Design a protein around this motif. Structure first.
Motif, short mmCIF file in Angstrom:
data_model
loop_
_atom_site.label_atom_id
_atom_site.label_comp_id
_atom_site.label_asym_id
_atom_site.label_seq_id
_atom_site.Cartn_x
_atom_site.Cartn_y
_atom_site.Cartn_z
N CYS A 179 0.91 -1.25 0.05
CA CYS A 179 -0.24 0.01 -0.02
C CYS A 179 0.92 1.03 -0.33
O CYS A 179 1.74 1.44 0.46
CB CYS A 179 -1.48 -0.05 1.38
N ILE A 180 0.27 2.06 -0.41
CA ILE A 180 0.79 4.00 0.05
C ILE A 180 -0.22 5.23 -0.74
O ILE A 180 -1.57 4.72 -0.98
CB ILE A 180 1.82 4.09 -2.09
N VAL A 181 0.57 5.67 0.61
CA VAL A 181 -0.79 6.58 1.45
C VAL A 181 -0.32 7.74 1.23
O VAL A 181 0.65 7.58 2.18
CB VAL A 181 -1.66 6.10 2.45
N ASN A 197 -13.29 15.86 0.06
CA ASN A 197 -14.49 15.93 -1.32
C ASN A 197 -13.65 15.74 -2.62
O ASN A 197 -13.73 16.22 -3.54
CB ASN A 197 -15.43 16.78 -1.29
N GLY A 198 -13.36 14.04 -2.78
CA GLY A 198 -12.29 13.83 -3.88
C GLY A 198 -11.28 14.22 -4.18
O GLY A 198 -10.72 14.06 -5.56
N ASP A 199 -10.71 14.97 -3.17
CA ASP A 199 -9.15 15.49 -3.37
C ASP A 199 -8.20 15.70 -2.25
O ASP A 199 -8.41 15.09 -1.27
CB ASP A 199 -9.94 16.97 -3.60
N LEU A 229 1.52 19.28 -3.35
CA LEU A 229 2.87 18.19 -2.91
C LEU A 229 3.48 18.25 -3.84
O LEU A 229 3.48 17.41 -3.93
CB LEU A 229 3.31 18.21 -1.24
N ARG A 230 4.38 19.05 -4.86
CA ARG A 230 4.43 18.07 -6.24
C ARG A 230 5.81 16.81 -5.81
O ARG A 230 6.20 16.00 -6.97
CB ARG A 230 5.30 19.59 -7.41
N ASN A 231 6.64 18.01 -5.41
CA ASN A 231 7.53 16.32 -4.32
C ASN A 231 6.68 15.58 -4.26
O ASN A 231 7.72 14.06 -4.54
CB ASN A 231 8.87 16.82 -4.21
N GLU A 232 6.23 15.35 -3.26
CA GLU A 232 5.47 14.47 -2.93
C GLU A 232 4.57 13.57 -3.96
O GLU A 232 5.18 12.56 -4.15
CB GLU A 232 4.21 14.08 -1.81
N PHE A 233 4.05 14.39 -4.69
CA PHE A 233 3.92 13.50 -6.29
C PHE A 233 4.59 12.81 -6.45
O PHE A 233 4.98 11.66 -7.63
CB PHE A 233 2.98 14.65 -6.99
N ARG A 234 6.02 13.80 -6.72
CA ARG A 234 7.12 12.69 -7.92
C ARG A 234 7.60 11.27 -7.03
O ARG A 234 7.69 10.02 -7.18
CB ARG A 234 8.27 13.82 -7.90
N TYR A 235 7.42 11.38 -5.94
CA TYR A 235 7.66 10.11 -4.87
C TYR A 235 7.10 9.31 -5.27
O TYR A 235 7.28 7.96 -5.75
CB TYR A 235 8.29 10.59 -3.50
N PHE A 236 5.56 9.64 -4.94
CA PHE A 236 4.33 8.41 -5.30
C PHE A 236 4.79 7.52 -6.89
O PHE A 236 4.64 6.60 -6.64
CB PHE A 236 3.28 9.13 -5.03
N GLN A 237 4.76 8.58 -7.51
CA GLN A 237 4.98 8.17 -8.88
C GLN A 237 6.02 7.07 -9.10
O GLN A 237 6.21 6.35 -9.51
CB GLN A 237 4.93 9.50 -9.93
N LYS A 290 -13.56 5.47 -6.59
CA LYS A 290 -13.51 6.74 -6.37
C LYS A 290 -11.76 7.92 -6.22
O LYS A 290 -12.01 8.57 -6.86
CB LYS A 290 -13.83 7.10 -5.07
N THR A 291 -11.12 6.96 -5.93
CA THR A 291 -9.73 6.68 -6.21
C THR A 291 -9.67 6.84 -7.59
O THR A 291 -9.24 8.67 -8.03
CB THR A 291 -8.54 5.72 -5.17
N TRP A 292 -10.21 6.70 -8.55
CA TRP A 292 -9.57 6.23 -10.08
C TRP A 292 -10.04 7.90 -10.35
O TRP A 292 -9.60 8.50 -11.25
CB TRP A 292 -10.39 5.35 -10.67
N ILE A 333 -8.31 10.93 -9.54
CA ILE A 333 -7.21 11.38 -10.21
C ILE A 333 -7.61 12.43 -11.51
O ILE A 333 -8.89 11.75 -12.80
CB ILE A 333 -6.75 10.12 -11.04
N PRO A 334 -7.26 13.62 -12.25
CA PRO A 334 -7.83 14.04 -13.11
C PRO A 334 -7.19 13.27 -14.16
O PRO A 334 -6.55 12.93 -14.11
CB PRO A 334 -7.17 15.24 -13.29
N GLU A 335 -8.47 13.40 -15.47
CA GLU A 335 -8.10 13.24 -16.69
C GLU A 335 -6.70 13.05 -16.94
O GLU A 335 -6.06 12.59 -18.31
CB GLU A 335 -8.98 13.76 -17.81
N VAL A 370 3.95 4.41 4.02
CA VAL A 370 2.92 6.05 4.61
C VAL A 370 3.79 6.92 4.29
O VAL A 370 5.16 7.07 4.95
CB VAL A 370 2.83 5.01 5.69
N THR A 371 3.28 8.25 3.90
CA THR A 371 3.80 10.39 4.16
C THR A 371 2.82 10.02 5.26
O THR A 371 2.01 10.48 5.32
CB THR A 371 4.03 10.51 2.59
N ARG A 372 3.99 10.87 6.56
CA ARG A 372 3.00 11.48 7.57
C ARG A 372 2.89 12.91 7.16
O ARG A 372 4.20 13.71 7.01
CB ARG A 372 3.81 11.09 8.36
#
Ligand SMILES: NC(=O)C1=CN([C@@H]2O[C@H](COP(=O)(O)OP(=O)(O)OC[C@H]3O[C@@H](n4cnc5c(N)ncnc54)[C@H](OP(=O)(O)O)[C@@H]3O)[C@@H](O)[C@H]2O)C=CC1
Ligand SMILES: CCc1nc(N)nc(N)c1OCCCOc1cccc(-c2c(N)nc(N)nc2CC)c1
Length: 186
Positions: A6-8, A19-21, A27-35, A55-57, A60-62, A135-137
């Motif tokens: 899992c990753i979160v 609300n789906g966000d 956090l750009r580098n957090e997104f980069r880590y995830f990717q 709902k997670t799918w 994610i924006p198109e 897990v990102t805290r």
């Protein structure tokens, strides 16, 4: 097929969504880590697979959907086919894992990464077997309406460091955060 993970990213008050966000600013580098973590396969000629709730799918924006360089599998019992841009649809977590063990996929898929949401995390986390949680805290409270389930530390051990994961405190947009990895085997 390789490891199940899992990753979160979660706030102090255990919030993962509003609300789906995300509860917090981007956090750009957090997104980069995830990717990086979800897309990087340790085996040449293989891809990782991402499993997520419906709902997670759709949260994610198109523009960012499907998660590129990974096989994208969506869980739903209402849907009759994978959403536009997704690859696979399963009606349960066990079904999704079975699918990866098929002759088709078992030679193609390295790591399986559950990327959300709450019920998917809970199901995987409470399911016997080898599992890691990345897990990102996010070290602030953020108003949220979706929460990460409890991590049972009797069975999930926080690892002292992990390759490719920075061990020190990060900060973006005045928000401090850190990366953790937990591992169980039961
Ligand atoms: N901070 C983070 O790291 C993350 C945050 N988020 C945020 O969390 C929220 C989305 O998560 P959440 O609301 O929990 O929803 P989910 O993504 O878990 O989606 C829930 C839906 O997926 C289906 N589903 C879930 N589990 C199963 C299953 N085991 N078998 C078959 N179908 C299943 C069901 O669809 P159906 O009703 O069709 O059966 C259910 O209604 C958003 O706010 C998003 O922005 C999401 C991921 C990560
Ligand atoms: C993230 C997709 C996305 N990308 C851009 N550029 N803008 C958005 N609004 C956006 O959606 C935001 C709501 C959807 O939340 C998710 C969806 C899947 C994964 C994670 C996720 C995760 N599972 N583990 C960690 N550690 N970190 C993240 C965030 C990078 C969060």
């Amino acid at each position: 097929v390789g490891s199940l993970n899992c990753i979160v990213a979660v706030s102090q008050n255990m919030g993962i969504g509003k609300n789906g966000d995300l509860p917090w600013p981007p956090l750009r580098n957090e997104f980069r880590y995830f990717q990086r973590m979800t897309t990087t396969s340790s085996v040449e000629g293989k891809q990782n697979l991402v499993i997520m709730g419906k709902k997670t799918w759709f949260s994610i924006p198109e523009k960012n959907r499907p998660l590129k360089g990974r096989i994208n599998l969506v869980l739903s019992r209402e849907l009759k086919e994978p959403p536009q841009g997704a690859h696979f649809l399963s009606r349960s977590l066990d079904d999704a894992l079975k699918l990866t063990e098929q002759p088709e996929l078992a030679n193609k898929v390295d790591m399986v990464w559950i990327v959300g949401g709450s019920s998917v995390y809970k199901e995987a986390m409470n399911h016997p077997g080898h599992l890691k949680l990345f897990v990102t805290r996010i070290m602030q409270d953020f108003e949220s309406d979706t929460f990460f389930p409890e991590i049972d530390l009797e069975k999930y051990k926080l690892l002292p460091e992990y390759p490719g994961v920075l061990s020190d405190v990060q900060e973006e947009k005045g928000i401090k955060y850190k990366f953790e990895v937990y591992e169980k085997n039961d």
